[PDB]
């Protein structure tokens, strides 16, 4: 009800936008999933600022379901690699890891927004409510642009992991016979297929009504299609292409470092307080 709604919407929008781009440059499997988590948190914070509780709560539970599954998949993948999170080493896991890759595919699609998975029921209704209410022009663009970005990096990760040709080391422990790890995963996997629809009939004693023109209701799917193609297609390469990330070196370093936030918060700040400790003790506790 107050000015804080104005601010939270802006800050949240950047958070979901920034990691959306950051996820398209990071190369650590463990980190890409982390920015993915953070990117969707901004989505809740923004819709939450609109004034809706069930929508935020509904998506929150949905996020926990499949996002936990993704990390479980990553742990199995990494442990079979030589403890390396980098995606540039991995590749071709769709056949070397049948079961784990299948466990990932469902989770990734849930993030993508394939209709009637866990994520779709939450992402859809949220985007629809955004287009129904009185939103900011800048906020609206970030909402839908991030969804394109959300699918972009996700299939970018598909290429570097499953469809991409193998790029590992000479000695590879590729194996998918860890049943003890797998049984726990199928608990989440079942829920990620029914968690969405189940909660729709329970969370909402008064379902939201929506009636929007076709050329916006279909925008959520269309961007997801563009994002999936754009993320996948651009990920490809050849011998005589242009390393666009290298060419715009300054921009890539900016977006690949999360806008220098780690530097700002870890190397641009700690120098000053710690020096002050010396000047005090140097000049008072053993000086004046």
């Amino acid at each position: 009800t107050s000015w804080l709604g104005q601010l939270m919407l802006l800050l949240s929008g950047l958070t979901m936008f920034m990691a959306g781009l950051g996820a398209n440059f990071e190369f650590d499997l463990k980190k890409i999933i982390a920015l993915s988590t953070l990117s969707q948190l901004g989505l809740m914070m923004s819709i939450l600022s609109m004034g809706f509780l069930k929508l935020a709560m509904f998506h929150l539970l949905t996020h926990a379901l499949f996002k936990a599954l993704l990390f479980m998949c990553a742990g199995a993948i990494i442990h079979n690699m030589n403890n390396s999170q980098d995606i540039r080493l991995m590749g071709g896991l769709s056949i070397h890891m049948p079961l784990t890759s299948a466990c990932f595919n469902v989770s990734n699609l849930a993030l993508c927004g394939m209709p009637f998975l866990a994520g779709f029921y939450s992402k859809d209704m949220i985007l629809e409510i955004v287009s129904i209410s009185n939103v900011n022009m800048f906020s609206f663009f970030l909402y839908y642009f991030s969804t394109g970005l959300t699918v972009s990096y996700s299939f970018r990760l598909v290429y570097y992991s499953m469809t991409g040709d193998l790029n590992c080391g000479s000695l590879n422990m590729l194996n998918d016979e860890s049943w003890i790890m797998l049984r726990g995963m199928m608990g989440l996997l079942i829920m990620s297929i029914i968690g969405g629809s189940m909660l729709n009939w329970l969370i909402f004693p008064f379902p939201y009504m929506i009636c929007l023109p076709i050329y916006m209701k279909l925008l959520t799917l269309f961007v997801c299609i563009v994002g999936g193609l754009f993320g996948y297609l651009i990920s490809l390469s050849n011998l005589f292409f242009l390393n666009k990330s290298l060419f715009m070196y300054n921009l890539s370093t900016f977006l690949g470092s999360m806008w220098f936030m780690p530097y700002i918060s870890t190397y641009g700040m700690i120098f000053y307080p710690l020096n002050y400790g010396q000047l005090v003790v140097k000049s008072f506790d053993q000086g004046w």
């Binding site: 307080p273 710690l274 005090v280 003790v281 506790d285």
Partner: protein, 446 residues
């Protein structure tokens, strides 16, 4: 109340009989239990005996000392192991405890002062007698001379109050309000020293770093409280004068707390770092105390109890590490999680309490001083945010740096932790939590 005093007096001869070191603590622990049963106190004084009473304020501080002074004997088992004048050592604590019990149980202001400082000399013997490093001299004087220099002028301020009130008894004093500027400085600059205030704390890092483990306990455990306890009794009739100069003390302690926290981050000595952590929290205690509000007073009483148990607790752990690694520097002490993993648990809980972590009694008191200070002036939110932030910055550095990393290379083989050490740590922390259940008693002294 005399039940306690005469119990202690007749335990003095146990110092002389041989092979009675361990039979002493049990008599010291048992009396705590007996004292723990006689809680029926109120804001006003109760159980009068010739000049000795006890209210809810004095009770908690007395009971804190009996607990702490009992743990001193557990901690300083090395004195028993090497028969290093243990009999004299025991007599020092039994005498010291009696001075504390009288100091808090005294009903008249002159008495409080009489045993206020008199407890110092048993402490001073403790530092010189059983301290390792050569600097216990140059730290023995600081403790004695900062205190005496500011306590002797307080004696004049006490006598000047007879000729106006006609008596010392605390209740009769509260009926008056004095307007003389110097008198204000002759009854608070004497306690502001012992708190300590940031600019007159130069004795605290020296006394604590050099004193033995037991001396560290009582110095950090009860001596810093006698300054705090004294203020709670003498701002009652300095209310008017307190309003003209409080803003000087609040600013110094608040800014003093922040600056010391940075100083903590640049320390490299465990004993030094814990000692400087005492000044940080004691700045909040003093700050809230001088706010004079109901919350700032009850909260300050609470935090003094909690902080003493914790800072006393953290001095146990530094002694444990120092006893084996032989050096108290942070560089030597690394990765102790990989030598003494069972010990590292106690490091965390005592460390966590120091940073106002729940559900400790420390967080209850700190919530309150924070409330009073904020109500005093919304400008206090600036550093009060910084101080609480940095008050965890060094605590993590203290814990993480000493427990986490890869082990030291030059260290020679040493014993692992013993049951005595674990039992000592439990008695420090475990009350610090369960006390939250009955904060009813150790909070509402007003």
């Amino acid at each position: 109340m005399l039940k306690i005093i005469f119990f202690l007096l007749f335990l003095i001869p146990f110092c002389f009989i041989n092979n009675m070191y361990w039979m002493v603590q049990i008599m010291m622990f048992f009396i705590s239990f007996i004292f723990l049963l006689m809680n029926n106190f109120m804001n006003y004084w109760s159980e009068i005996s010739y000049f000795l009473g006890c209210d809810m304020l004095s009770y908690g501080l007395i009971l804190l000392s009996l607990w702490i002074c009992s743990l001193m004997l557990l901690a300083s088992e090395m004195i028993n192991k090497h028969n290093n004048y243990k009999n004299l050592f025991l007599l020092n604590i039994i005498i010291l405890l009696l001075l504390l019990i009288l100091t808090f149980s005294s009903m008249s202001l002159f008495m409080f002062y009489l045993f206020f400082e008199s407890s110092l000399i048993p402490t001073l013997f403790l530092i010189l007698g059983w301290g390792y490093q050569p600097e216990r001299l140059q730290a023995g004087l600081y403790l004695l001379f900062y205190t005496l220099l500011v306590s002797l002028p307080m004696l004049i301020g006490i006598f000047y109050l007879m000729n106006k009130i006609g008596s010392m008894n605390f209740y009769l004093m509260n009926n008056f309000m004095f307007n003389y500027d110097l008198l204000y400085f002759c009854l608070l600059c004497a306690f502001l020293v012992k708190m300590p205030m940031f600019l007159v704390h130069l004795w605290l890092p020296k006394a604590h770093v050099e004193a033995p483990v037991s001396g560290s306990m009582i110095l950090a455990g009860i001596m810093l409280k006698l300054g705090g306890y004294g203020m709670l009794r003498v701002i009652s009739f300095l209310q008017l004068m307190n309003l003209k100069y409080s803003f000087v003390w609040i600013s110094i302690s608040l800014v003093g707390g922040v600056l010391v926290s940075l100083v903590c981050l640049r320390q490299t000595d465990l004993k030094a770092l814990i000692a400087y952590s005492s000044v940080a929290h004691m700045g909040i205690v003093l700050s809230g105390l001088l706010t004079m509000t109901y919350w700032g007073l009850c909260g300050s009483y609470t935090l003094m109890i909690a902080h003493g148990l914790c800072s006393s607790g953290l001095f146990c752990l530094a002694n444990v590490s120092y006893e084996r690694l032989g050096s108290r520097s942070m560089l030597i002490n690394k990765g102790l999680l990989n030598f003494m993993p069972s010990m590292t648990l106690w490091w965390f809980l005592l460390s966590s309490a120091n940073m106002a972590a729940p559900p400790t009694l420390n967080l209850l008191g700190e919530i309150y001083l924070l409330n009073s200070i904020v109500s005093w002036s919304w400008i206090s939110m600036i550093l009060l945010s910084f101080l609480s932030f940095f008050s965890a910055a060094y605590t993590l550095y203290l814990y993480s740096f000493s427990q986490h990393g890869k082990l030291f290379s030059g260290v020679y083989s040493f014993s692992s932790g013993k049951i005595r050490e674990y039992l000592l740590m439990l008695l420090h922390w475990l009350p610090l939590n369960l006390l939250i259940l009955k904060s009813e008693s150790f909070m509402l002294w007003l």
